[PDB]
Amino acid sequence: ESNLRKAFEEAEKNAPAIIFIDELDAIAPKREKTHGEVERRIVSQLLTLMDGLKQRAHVIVMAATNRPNSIDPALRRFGRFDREVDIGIPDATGRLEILQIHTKNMKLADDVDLEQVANETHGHVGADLAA
Amino acid sequence: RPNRLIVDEAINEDNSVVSLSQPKMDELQLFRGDTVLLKGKKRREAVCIVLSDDTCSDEKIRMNRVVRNNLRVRLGDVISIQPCPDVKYGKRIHVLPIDDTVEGITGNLFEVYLKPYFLEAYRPIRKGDIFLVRGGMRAVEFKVVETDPSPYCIVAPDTVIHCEGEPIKREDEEESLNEVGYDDIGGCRKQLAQIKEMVELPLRHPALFKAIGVKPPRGILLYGPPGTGKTLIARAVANETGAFFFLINGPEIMSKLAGESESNLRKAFEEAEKNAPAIIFIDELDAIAPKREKTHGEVERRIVSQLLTLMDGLKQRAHVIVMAATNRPNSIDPALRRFGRFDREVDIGIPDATGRLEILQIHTKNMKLADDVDLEQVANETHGHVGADLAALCSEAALQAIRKKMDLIDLEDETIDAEVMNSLAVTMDDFRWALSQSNPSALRETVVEVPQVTWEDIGGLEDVKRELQELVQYPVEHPDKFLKFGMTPSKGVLFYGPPGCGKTLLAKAIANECQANFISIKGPELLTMWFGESEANVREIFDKARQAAPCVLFFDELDSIAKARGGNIGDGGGAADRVINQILTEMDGMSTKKNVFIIGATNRPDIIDPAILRPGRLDQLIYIPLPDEKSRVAILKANLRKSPVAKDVDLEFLAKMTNGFSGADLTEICQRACKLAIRESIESEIRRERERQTNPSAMEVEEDDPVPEIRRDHFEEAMRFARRSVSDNDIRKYEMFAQTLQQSR
Amino acid sequence: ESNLRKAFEEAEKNAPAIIFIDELDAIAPKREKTHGEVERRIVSQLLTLMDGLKQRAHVIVMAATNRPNSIDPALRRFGRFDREVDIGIPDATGRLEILQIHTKNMKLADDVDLEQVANETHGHVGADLAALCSEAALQAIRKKMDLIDLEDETIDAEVMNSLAVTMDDFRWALSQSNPSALRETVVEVPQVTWEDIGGLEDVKRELQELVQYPVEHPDKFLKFGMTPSKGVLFYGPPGCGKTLLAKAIANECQANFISIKGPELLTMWFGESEANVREIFDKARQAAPCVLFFDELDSIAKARGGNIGDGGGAADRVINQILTEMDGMSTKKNVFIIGATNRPDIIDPAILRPGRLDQLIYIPLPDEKSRVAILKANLRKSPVAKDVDLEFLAKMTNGFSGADLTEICQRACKLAIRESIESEIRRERERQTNPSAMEVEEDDPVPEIRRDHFEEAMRFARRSVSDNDIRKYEMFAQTLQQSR
Ligand SMILES: Nc1ncnc2c1ncn2[C@@H]1O[C@H](COP(=O)(O)OP(=O)(O)OP(=O)(O)O)[C@@H](O)[C@H]1O
Ligand SMILES: Nc1ncnc2c1ncn2[C@@H]1O[C@H](COP(=O)(O)OP(=O)(O)O)[C@@H](O)[C@H]1O
Ligand SMILES: Nc1ncnc2c1ncn2[C@@H]1O[C@H](COP(=O)(O)OP(=O)(O)O)[C@@H](O)[C@H]1O
């Protein structure tokens, strides 16, 4: 918990800052999945820390997760995380721009049909194309 | 004692107005424009202008918050009133704002605030007074630092106004006129009054309860959806009444390390005692006191037991009351519901259209809306939202209006200008845009309200209307003759007949007429509790129905379980039996005192088990005849309220062609005709724009949008490709079963 | 537990003493329901401490709980808790007495009907009545705040002497009230007398001989080796003095009464399946010699294979549990069991066995003079029909049930009430529409049943009872006819 507290206080000394936290479901699941006690303390501490962020400074916090269903509903009230943005799977065109970005340095020969590859690569993601 | 009056709320928004009953002010020689000096405790004095009021009693005085704080007084206090018509116009007055108002403000406060606020105002002002001016979207404070003549002076067109000087520092004896109050809540009037009196009785006269000896309530529970201002209500009540409100947060409690946690509670209880009578608010009780089966460890049970011991051991001493808040009054452990514990429970329902309108009115007070607001439209179309939703919507609309102003505010400066800010306004397009990027939070929940369906919306059934009046209005309006006869009014009425005849419309109309709350239950959710979740929900549903007394619980598609009783599956006998048991046990268990009525509706009277059909149960039965002749005409009139006009063909003629048709069929006919009219308008507009564009950018004559001009053509076409969906076999079956049940009973 | 130990070590060393335990079930739930480890240690320590203090000793133990079964059963051996005392909710007499107790110092005005309130506040507790008294006093004080010294400090306790309460304050307090018992079994002697029922004098005599007779002269019963059967069944048309009969006989016997109907049985069908009749019969057995009533007993027989095609679950479970529990009734306690049915043909003969429910009684339809007496009983009310006292119309009511007669009477009463409402409304809006030309208020002749009500009631005459049901009843009676 101290570390979390540490993070927050640093933002207080460091102007409007962005606080990004990753894999919330791994640390903030539903109470049904919670079998031990320490996780409850962690969730309560983080909720208290973030709810006390009223005014303070112009610090914005966002989180990364996979499924809002896996997230505990208590972290859905007003003043807490309310803005919701989803990132869908890109189409063939988006695959094309991703390939164009990743192939900027490469010396492609005069046989490359990026559009054809993008069409053939349905069901992939950015990491897939990078690899 | 015609010298002292008890203060209460004010209906006038001016800072120098007092409302009195006419005879009382006549006795004390008080009339319009009469300057009066008011003196109270703290050796504080003020000067005000007398105004009249009807609802204000002689002993009471309507007067607002600003002078309440100026006089350092709360509600119910007695004041010394003296007509003092010796005032003189001011000459040179130095006035300054408070320190916490000019932050990033700059500009000229004079021409924007002082100049308009003091135009033809003639406010009797006194040295040391403080007042507020509503800015473009903020609130500005101003305290006079010196006046001439002192201390009595009327603001006059000939004054030497000194606005120069540093904004004075905030006084620390009393905070300010910025925090919450009774004037900042909307949509909870009845419960607000209840809580207000239940806390005003102990918190104003503790010695009265000390001498009397009664036990004041020791715990009050509030339950409702999150973000409905429950904490706001508690804090506002505490601040207005005068106490030592000491909030405790649930989530931070178990965030501590074992025993220390509950020690905090103990410490809180300690500061509860030696701090005079005060109020304690506890939030998220379920987070700290869930159900017994929910608990898995031992720290949780120890915490719950510690809290129970602490609160039970509190027997009077300091006049301390406990306010608890929760989402739903079912997740809390039952043991904390007994006598000597939280017993008085209050619901915080979702605000209606009127509640939404008044809350939005409250939230937009500081801002400077454009002169195009249709607040009623927004309020009615934003159903399913809470106070937080409305506040967020207003904030977003203001922000977007600001954003579409960057040309004037291109980087502006680190110290913004007040004149530019006050020169802006928010239009309805901003509100619609904010609505576009908006999402309600209520969504899936029950709704309770008194509908607006009127009797004239349905043609015919005058005997049915009379019977409903007899069975609803009569018992409530004059129970005296009922008790003089001893006859017990029935509670069970059922409707049967052809579907789509607006039986639900009749239920809504009678609920509107009785001016009681309406609750609807539909067959889908009935089947939803038929499987999956058990019958337990029904229980609290009745409680909710019993909570909203007087109310009319409505059931639609009551034969759905009967349809599952005999159908293409016929395998849910146990679940159907459980449903029947639960509903019967709930309905027969209600007290005859409650002004709660039950209405059942179905179109399959032949399949309903007569187990429900019994005295002491749903026993009254009404058949709904199909629409006929003039009734259809009335229906043809009712759905013609709408908006368009079709003054080409007789409605009675169309009723003559549509003889023996269902009312829903008539509504479908009207809908199809209006669809054809919409298609005609669309194609005409498309043709006119096409002919205006084929001609190069031709704006020669604008073809005005045609007035609704539906001919016999559209009506005839609709009648052609639409017929009476109900066949005569259904009618004959209904009538034969009706006669069989008529002569079999 | 050290403090508990401390308590014990100070309990005996302080002369004869009494020890009370508050909310015992919170300390000793069932063993399986325990989840941690400290609670088991506490329970075992408590058991050891309380068992080890036998010696000579002078300390008695008090333990209070809500659910007797919720506690751990192990602490019920001899030396441990063995004697149980149930504290049920009071009755109207008890409610009135408690109200008197709480209001013994009240300077109430002589306008309150405590009896009416007590009858009105059924399903409450002593705490509820105390709260009602407190809030009534608060309302009375609130209605007269203005004159008392609210402006000054608290009253010198002499103005409050002038204060008084009203029954209207009590009604207002009752409006803002909430009972707590609600869903709770009721054990009491009913008040239905034999005057409430007409006809079936032979049936009444037979019931008397079955139930009353054994208690007065058991000497001849044991001399002849007679053990009266504990069980009877009723069959007949619905709504024909069935619950009324049980209430009347229980009242005459002046014993407690317990009822349960088919909806409850089907509630225990699924959900809380079984494990419920046991505690009900235990409650009856520990209770005073009383009567148990089983309404809609055929419901399970109606539900086992009737019209839905159920899953074959509680259909046998409930019946087997009931039979096993009643077979455990080894005389001694003089509690009787009564069952009611309307479709006895579906009942399996397992219950219809000697030792089990064996006595069978058919309930016929009322017979004119019986119908007349029933109507008179229903016609206590208030209005009186002078000219036509429902005689020739009563003659033509052949084939109707008592429920039908009650329905007709209620319809007539409500229509007369409607007539009074409309007449009074006519009078009043005529009085206000006219500029107060007339203001006299003479009582209308409504509180007297008039003949016109009789015709308008008989026009909507209801033939509720079907002769097919009667013929089915009689053919089934001949099917089980005692005369071969
Ligand atoms: N009736 C109301 N009138 C005005 N504003 C309201 C009302 N209800 C809610 N609000 C607004 O919602 C917010 C109140 O948030 P708050 O944290 O106090 O919620 P709550 O309903 O009291 O409880 P909880 O936070 O536990 O859900 C404020 O922005 C307030 O303006
Ligand atoms: N004045 C009226 N009289 C009869 N029916 C109407 C009237 N106004 C509307 N209706 C029709 O009644 C329908 C609602 O009937 P409802 O009470 O839902 O019956 P059901 O529940 O059997 O469908 C609406 O769809 C509407 O088309
Ligand atoms: N003296 C009487 N003789 C016959 N029936 C009566 C008499 N008094 C009342 N009743 C009716 O008998 C009914 C008793 O109900 P009950 O017979 O138990 O219904 P069910 O047979 O459907 O269970 C009451 O509803 C009442 O209307």
Numbering used by the authors:
A (entry chain B): 283 to 413
B (entry chain A): 22 to 766
C (entry chain C): 283 to 766
Task: Provide the authors' original text about this structure.
Endoplasmic reticulum–associated degradation (ERAD) maintains protein homeostasis by retrieving misfolded proteins from the endoplasmic reticulum (ER) lumen into the cytosol for degradation. Transitional ER adenosine triphosphatase (ATPase) (VCP/p97 in vertebrates and Cdc48 in yeast) was identified as the primary energy supplier for ERAD and has been shown to power the defolding of ubiquitinated proteins via its interactions with the heterodimer Ufd1-Npl4 (11–14) and the deglycosylation through its interaction with N-glycanase 1 (15, 16). In humans, Derlin-1, a homolog of yeast Der1, was found to form a tetrameric channel with a central tunnel ~10 Å wide, indicating a protein channel mechanism for retrotranslocation.
To further investigate the conformational change upon the ATP hydrolysis of p97, the DerΔ-p97Δ complex was supplemented with the nonhydrolysis analogs ADP·BeFx and ATP·BeFx before cryo-EM analysis. By contrast, the DerΔ-p97Δ complex assumes two distinct conformations upon addition of ATP·BeFx. In the other conformation represented by 20.8% of the particles, however, the Derlin-1γ/δ interface is disrupted by displacement of the p97 NTDs, resulting in a “U”-shaped structure (state U) with a large opening toward the lipid environment of the ER membrane. Nevertheless, the overall shape of the electron density and the C-terminal domain (CTD) associated with the p97 NTDs enabled reliable modeling. This opening, formed by the crevice between Derlin-1γ/δ, measures more than 30 Å in width. It appears to be caused by a conformational change of the NTDs of p97C/D from the up to the down conformation, which leads to pulling Derlin-1γ/δ away from each other and consequently breaking the γ-δ interface. In the p97 associated with the open Derlin-1 tetramer, all six protomers adopt a down conformation. Notably, resolution of the Derlin-1 part within this open conformation is limited likely, due to increased local flexibility upon loss of the rigid channel structure. An unexpected discovery was the conformation of openDerΔ-p97Δ/ATP·BeFx (state U). Here, the pulling action of p97 NTDs tore the Derlin-1 channel at the side wall to form an access between its central tunnel and the ER membrane, likely allowing the retrotranslocation complex to capture large protein substrates, such as partially unfolded proteins with some secondary structure retained.
